């Protein structure tokens, strides 16, 4: 289970598509950017992932 960081050093392209309540544009008090632009069950899943 120390698999944890054993994949840390790396980076992959995550593709997706917009659908409430899985992935959707974050709401902005101030303009949005990158992998912060979005919010959704899959969005907040990836973090945990």
């Amino acid at each position: 289970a120390n698999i944890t960081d054993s994949l840390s050093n790396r980076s992959l392209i995550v593709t997706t598509i917009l659908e409430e309540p899985y992935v959707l544009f974050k709401k902005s008090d101030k303009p949005l950017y990158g992998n912060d632009r979005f919010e959704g069950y899959c969005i907040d899943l990836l973090r945990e992932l």
Binding site: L18, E19, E20, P21
Partner: protein, 97 residues
């Protein structure tokens, strides 16, 4: 009744029922084998660019601006009839997955 199962819709061609385009649902009926679901398919395919939708949110529109019945995934239905309560689910789970 008016509607409780898919086949309710399948028989009567006085209601729009379709699904998001290039979605497993679309590919489901298209590539389905069951009588009904095949018969359900050829309905949509009879009206391809008119019953199908490019986004559920747009397929949601059809419901609230037409006589439409969207072949939506449960969890989304389960959801979309949490926020917006002017809507309803019809029947059980066609396909588990």
């Amino acid at each position: 009744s008016p509607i409780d199962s898919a086949d309710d819709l399948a028989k009567q061609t006085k209601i729009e029922y379709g699904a998001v385009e290039d979605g497993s649902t679309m590919t489901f009926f298209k590539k389905s084998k069951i009588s009904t679901y095949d018969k359900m398919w050829a309905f949509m395919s009879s009206r391809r660019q008119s019953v199908l939708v490019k986004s559920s949110e747009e397929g949601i529109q059809r419901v609230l601006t037409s006589d439409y019945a969207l072949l939506m995934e449960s969890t989304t239905i389960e959801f979309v009839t949490q926020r917006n309560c002017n809507l309803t689910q019809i029947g059980g789970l066609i396909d588990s997955k």
